[PDB]
Ligand binder design. Sequence first.
Ligand code: NA
Ligand code: NA
Ligand code: NA
Ligand code: NA
Ligand code: NA
Ligand code: NA
Lengths: 600, 600, 600
Amino acid sequence: FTIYYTGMTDIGPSMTGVISSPTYKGGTPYDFAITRITLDGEPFSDSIFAIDSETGKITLNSTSNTPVGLYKLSVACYSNNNRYEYTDIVEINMMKPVPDGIKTTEGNHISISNYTIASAMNIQPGKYILSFKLTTAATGEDPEKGIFENALEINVRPLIYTPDEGKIEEEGERSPETTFQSNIPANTDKITIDPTTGVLSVAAHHGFKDGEKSVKAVFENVFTLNTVEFIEPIANFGYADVNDVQAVEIDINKNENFKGDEVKYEFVNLPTDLQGELALDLDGNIAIKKGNKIPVGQYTVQVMATNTKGSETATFTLTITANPNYFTYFRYGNNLGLTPIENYADQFRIEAGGKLNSVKPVPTATDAKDGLSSLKWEVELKHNPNNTKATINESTGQITITGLKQGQCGMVMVTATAGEGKTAVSVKQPVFFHFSMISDSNVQLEYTPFVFQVNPARGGESIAPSLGAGIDKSTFRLDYRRDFFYYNIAGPDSHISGALAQKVDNFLSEMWNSYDATAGTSRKPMSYFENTTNLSKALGYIDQTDFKVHINPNLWRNKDGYANGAMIGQITYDVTGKDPQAATSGARVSPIFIWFDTKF
Amino acid sequence: FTIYYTGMTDIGPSMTGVISSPTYKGGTPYDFAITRITLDGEPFSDSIFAIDSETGKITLNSTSNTPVGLYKLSVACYSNNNRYEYTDIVEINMMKPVPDGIKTTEGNHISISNYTIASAMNIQPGKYILSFKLTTAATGEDPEKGIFENALEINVRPLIYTPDEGKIEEEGERSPETTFQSNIPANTDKITIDPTTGVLSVAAHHGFKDGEKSVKAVFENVFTLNTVEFIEPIANFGYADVNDVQAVEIDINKNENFKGDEVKYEFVNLPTDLQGELALDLDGNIAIKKGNKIPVGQYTVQVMATNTKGSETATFTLTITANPNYFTYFRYGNNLGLTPIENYADQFRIEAGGKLNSVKPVPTATDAKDGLSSLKWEVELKHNPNNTKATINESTGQITITGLKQGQCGMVMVTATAGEGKTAVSVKQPVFFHFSMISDSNVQLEYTPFVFQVNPARGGESIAPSLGAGIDKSTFRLDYRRDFFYYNIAGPDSHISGALAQKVDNFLSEMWNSYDATAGTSRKPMSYFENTTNLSKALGYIDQTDFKVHINPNLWRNKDGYANGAMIGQITYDVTGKDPQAATSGARVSPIFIWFDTKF
Amino acid sequence: FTIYYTGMTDIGPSMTGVISSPTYKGGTPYDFAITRITLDGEPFSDSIFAIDSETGKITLNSTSNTPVGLYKLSVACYSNNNRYEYTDIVEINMMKPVPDGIKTTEGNHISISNYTIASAMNIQPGKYILSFKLTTAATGEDPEKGIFENALEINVRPLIYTPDEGKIEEEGERSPETTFQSNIPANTDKITIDPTTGVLSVAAHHGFKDGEKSVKAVFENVFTLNTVEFIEPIANFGYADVNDVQAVEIDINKNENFKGDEVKYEFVNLPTDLQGELALDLDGNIAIKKGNKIPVGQYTVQVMATNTKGSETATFTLTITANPNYFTYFRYGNNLGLTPIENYADQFRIEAGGKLNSVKPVPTATDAKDGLSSLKWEVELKHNPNNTKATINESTGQITITGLKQGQCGMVMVTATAGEGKTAVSVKQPVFFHFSMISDSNVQLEYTPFVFQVNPARGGESIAPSLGAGIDKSTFRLDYRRDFFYYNIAGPDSHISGALAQKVDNFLSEMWNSYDATAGTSRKPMSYFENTTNLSKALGYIDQTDFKVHINPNLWRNKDGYANGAMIGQITYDVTGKDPQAATSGARVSPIFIWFDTKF
Ligand code: NA
Ligand code: NA
Ligand code: NA
Ligand code: NA
Ligand code: NA
Ligand code: NA
C-alpha cells in the first residue's frame, strides 16, 4: 500500500471545495483520520480541516478560526485491515484575504503591484469561479501578498450515462417485486425520469419479461434497459473446519446448502505457507493434493464469493498435524569411493569388462520414522528405454538392471513408500548407472562422479575425467555429437521428456531452437568445435584441455521455469588431435549424465 | 502447559514395557517426538528408544544396540497448536546384564556381594515378573553391578465395566441400523458376549424400543443397556463473517440449517480483546452489546459444538471498523477554580445564601468527532431523589437543578449522544452539586473539591475543608452520623443503589454488615468517635485535626468486585470540643460526595 | 532524493531502443550502475542490460544471450554526493520471438488465436515501427504467446529551435576569437548552416559589434543571433579560512583578485548549525552578525558562483572557539514570594499606597563567566512611554522607575554586557513592574504573578487574581476595555510595537483586523461580554468565575511568525454584576502583562 496527496496549495478562509485528494496503489483505503495539524512548526489545537473518512478528501471547516500561515496535516488510514500513518503528508498555505475595497480599487486607496490567477473553480458550459493572488498596499504601507477569493463568475443548449446499459429482472416467486434505477447522467409507459436529475426509474410490477430490451432535455437511444432472469443471491456459503495430517489428499467442499447463481470465487489474504498448496475450483470447492508441502500448524483460510447481487466471505480453520509416515529422503550412495554420499547423486559404475548382474545396489539410509526396513519400493526405468530394463525387490529396494550397453549410462526413478492407505507417504529419487568399457584405441573414459549435479541458473563445470592408462591427453579430443535425451524430474509440465528428434516437439527441441532456429538435431548447441569463436553461446560444451563438461549460465530453462531433470548425449572422441565429429562406432560413448536442479 | 515424566530409571536390554510416561497440566498433548538422545554426554546415533506419538510413553526398541550407561532423552510435543521442547527431560540408565550362569550360581563360579529388587512387573491375581540388581564377580575379578532381568515368575476363581451403563438407540428412518459395544471389563437373545474378552455387543435390527433397559466367567447386573431416542449429529454448523463499526449491537446467529440434538457450545481460543465482549447463548448464537469495547481490528472467532455423537468447530471472521459517532468523554468542569479540570469531578457549588437558579452549567469540552455542538443530551437525577429534580436542555446540555436543600450535595447522571439510529454512541458521566450555607454557630463547611475521587483498593484522604471565617479549629469536631445513600455508577449489579435503611438489602447494608453484623443503621462503620481504639476497622472516618474524610483500604467492595459509585452521608458538628452525635437540626450537613473508582 | 522507472515491460531479443528511463525528485542523479540482474528468481550472470551512467536509461546489449522470462534489475546511483541503491526497481519481461514464417503465415502452417499491438516505435511525419504480441501454434502443438518484432514500417513537406534566441560576443583583447553554434532544430555572409542537421554556425572574425542582431529546408525569422559584450569568466574565486570566537561580528570577504561579470552566488550544502547565521550578499561576501548563535566547532562552507560562462565553487573552513565573555542570562527574580525564580518573569510589585522609590531591584544571578559583578548594565523604558521613566546604575544593575501611575504595570528592557570591544557579549531581557492600588469600591486587584507567560501556539490561562479584602466575587465583573499596547521582544520585524490607534498600522491593528475588519480600536477582540455566544473567536478574554485572562490558541501571530513580545491593556470592573464597559475613571486598571513566547 502506497499513498500521496495532490490538490490546492494556497487557499483563503472562504474555500468550500476539496483542498486535497489521495492517489493510492494497493488495497482501497478507508477509515481516514487527521491525526495532527501543525501551523508554522507548532501544534494547532482547533479542528480547522476535515477529512472524509471514506474518500480521504480534505476540506476546510467553515466555523474554525483561520490564522495565516503554512499548515501541515498528518493522516492515518487503513488498507486491507492494516493501519498506516503519514506525518505531514498534506501542506496547506492559508493566506490573508486582500483588503476590503477591491472589485472585479475603492477610490484608488489600494495599489496593486502583482496580479496572478490563484485558481478557477477544454471549456465547459456552466459557471467558472476565479480567484486571484495580489500584492497590495495602502499609501505608505508595506506591501502584502493576499488572496482575492470568488472574484469573478464567468457563465459559459444541452448527455452521457455511465454505464449506458443496465439490467432489470423479471418478477416471480423468488423476487415478486423488482425495480431499476440508473446513475445520474453527466414502447412502454413503465420507465420514468426525474425531470431535474435525469435519473431513469422503473417501479415494481412493470410486467417486463426476460429477453426484452431516448431523452429530451433529443438524445436518442442514450440508455438501454435489459430484462433478465433472476440471479439468486449468495446464501449458506461456508466450509467446515478441517483437521488432517501432513502430505495427504484433502477435499474441502463448501456446504451443500449453498445458494447463488453465476458466482466467482477467490482467496482473501491466503497465508504464505498455503500459497500454491490449495486450489480453488470454479464451484468454490478446494483441493489439497497428496504430497503437498503444507507445514504442520493451524491456518485461517478465507474465500470470497461474488455475483452481481454482491459478495460474501466465508472462513474456516485448517489444522495439519504430524503424519506418522512422513519422511523426506532415502539414499543408496555410490560405489565410486565418494563421500559424504549426500554430496553426490546415487550412482553406480559397472567396471570395464564387468557384468551388470554384479551391481545390484541396496538402499543404505533414510529419515523414515519406522526405519529403513519399514519402506516398500518401486522402480521405473527412464534411460535407455530402447534397450534397458529395471526391476526392484519390493521389500529390500535392491535394484537389478539388464540390457544397459557397455559405454553408456542408465537412469531409473525409485519410489519408496512408508505406510499404507490414505496416509501413506512416498518419496521419489533418481538412481544412475554407468557401464564402463575400454572402447576404441584403449580409451577408458570415466567421469567420477559421472552424474554432474549442476545449477542451471549459475551453470558450472563437471569433474575432469580419467581417459585410461596410456592415453595421451595432448592429442585427445572430445565433443558431444548426437543422440540427446532429456528426462524431466520435477520441472514444469512443458519440459517434455524424450529424445531430440525431427518432427518431435519436446524440451530438447525447444532448447535447440533457443540456440538457433536452424540447429535441427545437430551437435551444434552442445559442441566445442562448432562454437570456438564464441563459446558463451553454446548450451554447453566440453573443453579440450581437461575434458570437463561446461554448462553455460541461465540457458537451461523455458518460459515456465528452470530445468529440473537429467540430460544424456552421445560424446565422440579422436586420439590424433582432430575434431571427433566423424568418429566411427567404437569411439562413441555416453559417459556422463547432467542433472539440473536450482537446489544444487 | 506443563509436563514431566515418571517411570523406571534402571533397565536392561530385555525391557519390553513402558519405561517412562508423562504427567501434564493444560491442553492434552499430542504429536510427541524424541528430538535427541545422548549417552554419557555425547550424541547417540541409533533410534534406541521410541515414543508413542499420541501418549508420549517411552519404550525400548528391541533391534537396537544397547551399550551401557546413562541415556538422556529430549522430547517435543504440541498442546493447543503450540510446540514445546524439553532438553534431557527423561533419563534412562541402561545396565549390563548379570553374567550367564545365574539361576533363580552355575557351579559357584560367580559370587554375589549385593542383592536388590530392581522391579516387579494390594496383591493381584496374575503373573508377577521380578528383576534384580546384583553385584557380582568371577574369582579374582573386579566386582560389577548388573541387572538380572525376568529372574522369577510368581503366579497368584474370577468383574468391573468402566463405565457400567451404556446407551443404544431405537432404529428408525434416520438411523435404520444401530449397534452397541461396551469397553473391555477389568429377557433377550440380542445381547452377545465375546467369551475371551467379555465385551458386550448388539448387532443391528435388535428391535429395542426407547425406554427399555448378568455375566458368568456369576456377576449379576454387572452391566445396564439403555435403549434411547436417536440423537441427531451436528451438521451445517456455521456462522457468516461479520463486518460492523465500533460500539454497536451485533447479533451473530448460526446458520438456520443447523442440525444436532442436545448440543453444548464453547469458544475455542477466543482472542484476548473479545473476552467479555461476546456472549454465547444456549442455542449457540452470539450477542455483542451496544457500547461494547471491542477495538477496531479483524478477529478470528471459533466455536465448538458438542453432543454425544461428537464435536464440530466452526470459524468466522469478525471485522470492526471506525464508527463516525465514536467518542469517549465530555466535560463540564467546575466553578471551584480547580484546574486542570480533568483531574477533578464535574462539580458546581452554589454559594452560601445563593440561589440554585444562578448555577446552570453547560458542557465545555469533548472528543466527539463532529464537535461539542453535535451532541444531544439527557439527564437523570440521582440524589436527592426525595426532594431534588434535574432537567437538561436537549441541544445545549445546560443543566438546571431545583429542590436541592441548603447544606447538601446533589448528583445527576448526564448522557451525551452522538449520531442517530443503530450507530449512535452514548457516554454517561456524573455531575455533582453542593448547595453551601452558613449553618449553626456561623459554620460554613466547604470541601474544595467536594467530590473526593478515591481508589477503593488503595483508600486515601480528602482535601481538608474550610470551616468558615471565625471558626475555631481547635474546638471543632466533625463526624458522619446518619442518612447514608449509595449510587452504583459502573460497579457490579449486586452493588444495589439506595439509602441505608432497616429491612432493605442493598450495597450499604452489605457494607455495614462487613463492618459488624450489629451495626444496623448506626454511624459506627463511618465514625471517628466509635472507632478511636482501632481506626483501621472503620470503613471510613473524619479526623479531628484537619477534618479530612479518610477511606480505609480494600473495604469498599463485595464478592463481585470493588465499589464503582458514589456515597453521601449526613455529617454533624460541634463547636465546643465534644462528640457531635447529638447535634441538633441546624448543625447537620452533607458537604462531601465520595466517588469510588479503581481508575482513580 | 526519490526515483522510479517507467518504460516498456515486454520486449524481444531485437529491441534496440531505450527500455526504461528514470523520473526523479531532488538532486540530479549521476554515476548510475546496475548492481544485480535476476531472472525468474535466480542470479543472471551475463551483462544482458546496460545503463547509461549519466542518464540512467536502460538498453539491451545486443551480443548477450536472451533466455525467456522476467528479469529484475537492481540500480544504484548518486545524488548530491550520496549513494542510493534500489533492489528490483526495473522489471523486464523477455519474450520468445514468434515462429519463423509469419509475415505482415507461411502456407497456413501456423495459426494465431490472439492479436495485440506490443508497441509502435498526434501523428508525426516519419517512420513508425509496429510490434505485435501473438498467440500461435503449429498444427497439434500447444499454443505460445510470442513477440512479433519490427513487423511493419509505416512512413507518414517540412522547424523549431530550442531555444530560438542565442548570444555571440564582440571580439576584443580579452576574447580575440569568438564563435557561435545553435542546438539542432526539431544582411550578412558570416552565418552558415549545416545542410543536413540545420545547425546555425559562425566562425571567428565575424566582425559583429555589440547591439547588432530565415531558413529554407521557407521558415522566416526562425532564429535570432544577438551580438553582446564579453562576459568575463569566474577566476580567482576564493575565501580565506576563518578563526574567531563565539557571538562576534565577522565579515568573510572573497579574495580581492576575483574576476567574473554578472555573477550570482549560493551556498552548497551549508551545515545545519550555520543556516540562518551566515548571509551571502550580491557580491558574494558573507556576513556573520554580533550575537550570532553558531556553536563552538569547525565547519566547512561552500559557495557556488555562476554566470553565463559557467560555475565555480569555493570552499573555506570556519572555526568558532569559546568567547571568554560568553553568557546567556541574568535574573532579578521577584518580590512576590514566587520560586523557583526562573519559572517566573522578573517582576516587582509596589504595594498599594506605596512609593515607587521603595522598589529598586538589583540583579541576583547570572551564568557570566567572570561573575555577577563583572557585568555592566543599560536599561530602556518600554511602558508606559507617555509617563514612565527608567534609569539604571551602570555598575550594579539597580533599576529606578519614576512616573509609573498607581493601578498600572510598566516594563523595561535591561541589557547586561560582559567584556569590552569586539568580543563583548550582551544579553537583553524584560523586567516588569506593577504599581498596585486600592481603586474604586475598595477593589485591590492583584494577579500573582502579574506577568502571564503564555505560549501563543498553545494558548492558556493566567493565575486567578485576588480581588481585595471584602470584595464579593459573585457580583464582580471584569473585562478588557481600551488602551492596548504591544512591545515586540524577539518576534519578526513586522510585529510593529506600539499602541492600538486609529490610522496607525502596527501589530495590534493587524491582530484586531484578524478578529474582524470592523473591530477598529474597540474592546471586542479581547472582550468576554462581546463574545459570549462564541468565546473561541476572541483573541483573549477574562472569565467571570475566576477572573483569569484566557488566551486562545494559535491566534497571536501573523504571516511572519508567532508573537514574541508583551501586551498590556486597560481592564475595567463593576461590583454590581454588570458588564463593566462604562466603568468610570477610578474603576480602570492595567493589572497584568501578557508575555508571549513559544519557548514557554
Ligand atoms: Na464454516
Ligand atoms: Na522394506
Ligand atoms: Na461460515
Ligand atoms: Na448540541
Ligand atoms: Na580559500
Ligand atoms: Na557590575
